[PDB]
Design a protein around this ligand. Structure first.
Ligand code: HEM
Ligand code: HEM
Ligand code: HEM
Ligand code: HEM
Lengths: 141, 146, 141, 146
C-alpha cells in the first residue's frame, strides 16, 4: 500500500518531470530495449533504433498513463482498467517485463532528477511503479 | 558474461570515476530502505529506523565499501566470475541463506546509484553494459544454489 | 482479480479439504522446508523434522488463515490486515518466499485431491494464492 | 546439480512410472492455462480459448511429448545439463526470447502434474529431489542469457 508520504513523494518527483514527461518515457523504453533485449519482441512494427519517432511517441503514451496514475493514485485499478485489459489480454505481456520497465524508469529519473531521487523518494517511486505494475498484470484470464 | 570491447570500454571508463568510499554504502543503504525485508540480515548494524538513519549509519557505509570492492574484483575478472565469487557464494548461500533474488536487486540498486551520480553520462548503452555485469555477478554469487 | 468462476472453484476445492485443513498446511510447510532450504531460517525456534508438533500446529494456523481468506474473498486486504503487518513488518519475510509456499500448497492439494485439481481449478487456486501473497506482502515500509 | 543417491533413486524410480505420452502435454497445457501470457508463443497451435480446448488440443499434447523428452534427457545427464540443453538454450533464448522465469514456471507445473498423478507417492523428499532437477534444467536452458 502507498502511504501518505509515498503519495506526496511521487507527486513531487513526478511534478519535476514536466514537459520532459514524454521524453523520459521514451528514454526508459530505450533503456529497457537495450538492457533487456527479450522485451523487444513486443514491438516488431516499431523501429527501436535511437531517435525513432515511434519510440518517442510511445514514450509519451507511457508517461501519460503514469501521470494518470499519479493523478488518480487512490483509484488506480479503475483509472488503469482499460490499460490492464490491453496489456494482459490482447498483448499478453509477461509480468516479469513490468519489473524491467519499472527499473528502467527509476534509472531514467535518477539520471535526470538528482535532487529529487533521495533514498526515501526512490523507495516511494519503487512502490508506486510496483503498484502500477500490479494493476497492469491483474487481468490475465 | 561477454561484453563487447565498446561495452568494456564504457564500463571501465565510468568505474574509474566512481567514488569507492561512498557508492557501495549508498547502494547498500538504498537496498535496506527500498527493500526493507533485507534489514533482516543486518540486525547488528544498529539504527535502521529511518532512511536518514540508514544512510548515515557508519556500519552501512563500511560494509558497502566491501560490497563495492567485490564488484570491482568482478569487473577485473569478467571471464571468470564463478571462481571470483566462490567464497562469497558459500557465505551468502550456504551460511547466510540469502535468497538469490536479492543479489539481482542489489545489482539493480547499484545501477540506480550509478545513474544518480553520473546523470546523462550514464547513457542507455552504458547501462546495458552494466546490466550484463551485475547479472553476471548475481549469477556467480548464486552458484552454490545451482 | 478473481473472477466469479475463480471464487466458485476455490470455495469448492477448499471445501473438500475439510478436517484435513491443518494437516495439509503442515505438509505444505514441510514440502517448502525440504525443497527450498532458505525458508528454514525463519523458524529457528521450530524443530522442522518430520512429525514435529510445532510444524503441525503452525500448519493449522496457515490453513485457518487461508480459510479466513476464502470466507472473505471479496474483502481480503481487510481480513488479512493483521497477518500482513506481521509478515512484512515484524518477520520481514522476503516476498519470494510466498511464491515458494504457494507452489508447495498447490503441490499438496494436487497430491491429495486428484478429482478437484483440474486445470481450471489449478488456475483459480494459483490466482487465489497469488492474491493472498499480494496482501501479505503489502505492508513493507 | 547434485542429487544424493537417495534422491537419485527416488527420482529415477518415479520417472520410470511416468506416462511419457501424456504427462508432458498435461504440463504444457497447464502452463498455457495457468499462465496465459505463455500462449503468446503458441499462436500456431489453434484453439486455446478454454481450458478444455487447450488440454484436448492435439498440438499441445504433441509438443508436450517433446518437452518431456528433454526432461528425460536431462535426468540422464544430471552432471552435464549445460551441454545437454545447449541447442535448446539457443532456441529458447536467442531465437524465441522466452523470459527464463517461464522455464522455472514450467518446471513447477511439471512438479504439480507429478504430484497429481502420483499422489501420496510424491512425498515431500521426492518433491525436494525433483525441485533440484527442474531448477537445474531451467538454469541450463537459461545459459545463453548468462
Ligand atoms: C509502467 C508500465 C507500463 C505502462 C504505464 C504502459 C503504458 C502503455 C500505454 C499508455 C500504451 C498505449 C495504449 C493505447 O494506445 O491504447 C501501451 C501499449 C503497449 N505496451 Fe505498455 N505500458 C507499460 C508496460 C509495458 C511492458 C513492460 C511492455 C512489454 C515489455 C509493454 C508492451 C506494450 C505494447 C506491445 C503496446 C502496444 C504498442 C502498439 O501496438 O502500438 N507495456 N502501454
Ligand atoms: C551482488 C550482491 C552482493 C555482493 C557482491 C556482496 C558482497 C559481500 C561482501 C564482500 C561481504 C563481506 C565478506 C567478508 O567479510 O569477507 C558480504 C557480507 C555480507 N553480506 Fe553481502 N553481498 C551481496 C548481496 C547481499 C545481500 C543481497 C544480502 C542480504 C540482503 C547480503 C548479506 C550479507 C551479510 C549479512 C554479510 C555479513 C556476513 C558476515 O560478516 O558474516 N549480501 N557481502
Ligand atoms: C499463504 C501464505 C502464508 C500464510 C497464510 C501465513 C499464515 C501465517 C499465520 C496464520 C501465522 C501465525 C500468526 C500468529 O500466530 O499471530 C504465521 C506466522 C509466521 N509465518 Fe506465515 N504465512 C504465510 C507465508 C509465510 C512465508 C512464505 C513465510 C516464510 C518463509 C512465513 C513465515 C512465518 C513466520 C516465521 C511466522 C512466525 C512463527 C512463530 O514465530 O511462531 N509465512 N503465518
Ligand atoms: C524446462 C523448460 C522447457 C523445455 C525443457 C522445453 C523444451 C522444448 C523442446 C524439446 C522443443 C522442441 C525443439 C525442437 O523441435 O527441436 C521446444 C520448442 C519450443 N518451445 Fe520449449 N521448452 C521449455 C520451456 C518453454 C517455454 C516456457 C516456452 C514459452 C512460454 C517455450 C516455447 C517454445 C516454442 C514456441 C517452441 C517451438 C519452437 C519451434 O518449433 O521453432 N518453451 N521446447
Amino acid at each position: 500500500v502507498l502511504s501518505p508520504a509515498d503519495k506526496t513523494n511521487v507527486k513531487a518527483a513526478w511534478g519535476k518531470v514536466g514537459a520532459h514527461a514524454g521524453e523520459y518515457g521514451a528514454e526508459a523504453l530505450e533503456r529497457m530495449f537495450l538492457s533487456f533485449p527479450t522485451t523487444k519482441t513486443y514491438f516488431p512494427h516499431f523501429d527501436l533504433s535511437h531517435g525513432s519517432a515511434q519510440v518517442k511517441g510511445h514514450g509519451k503514451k507511457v508517461a501519460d498513463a503514469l501521470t494518470n496514475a499519479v493523478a488518480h493514485v487512490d483509484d488506480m485499478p479503475n483509472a488503469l482498467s482499460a490499460l490492464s485489459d490491453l496489456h494482459a489480454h490482447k498483448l499478453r505481456v509477461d509480468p516479469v517485463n513490468f519489473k524491467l520497465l519499472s527499473h528502467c524508469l527509476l534509472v531514467t529519473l535518477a539520471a535526470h532528477l538528482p535532487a529529487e531521487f533521495t533514498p526515501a523518494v526512490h523507495a516511494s517511486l519503487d512502490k508506486f511503479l510496483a503498484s502500477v505494475s500490479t494493476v497492469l498484470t491483474s487481468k490475465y484470464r | 558474461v561477454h561484453l563487447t570491447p565498446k561495452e568494456k570500454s564504457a564500463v571501465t571508463a565510468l568505474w574509474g570515476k566512481v567514488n569507492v568510499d561512498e557508492v557501495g554504502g549508498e547502494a547498500l543503504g538504498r537496498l535496506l530502505v527500498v527493500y526493507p525485508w533485507t534489514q533482516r540480515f543486518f540486525e547488528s548494524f544498529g539504527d535502521l529506523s529511518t532512511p536518514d538513519a540508514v544512510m548515515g549509519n557508519p556500519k552501512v557505509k563500511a560494509h558497502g565499501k566491501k560490497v563495492l570492492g567485490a564488484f570491482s574484483d568482478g569487473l577485473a575478472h569478467l571471464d571468470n566470475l564463478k571462481g571470483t565469487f566462490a567464497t562469497l557464494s558459500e557465505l551468502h548461500c550456504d551460511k547466510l541463506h540469502v535468497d538469490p533474488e536479492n543479489f539481482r536487486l542489489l545489482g539493480n540498486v547499484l545501477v540506480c546509484v550509478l545513474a544518480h551520480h553520473f546523470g546523462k553520462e550514464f547513457t542507455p548503452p552504458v547501462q546495458a553494459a552494466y546490466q550484463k555485469v551485475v547479472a553476471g555477478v548475481a549469477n556467480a554469487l548464486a552458484h552454490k544454489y545451482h
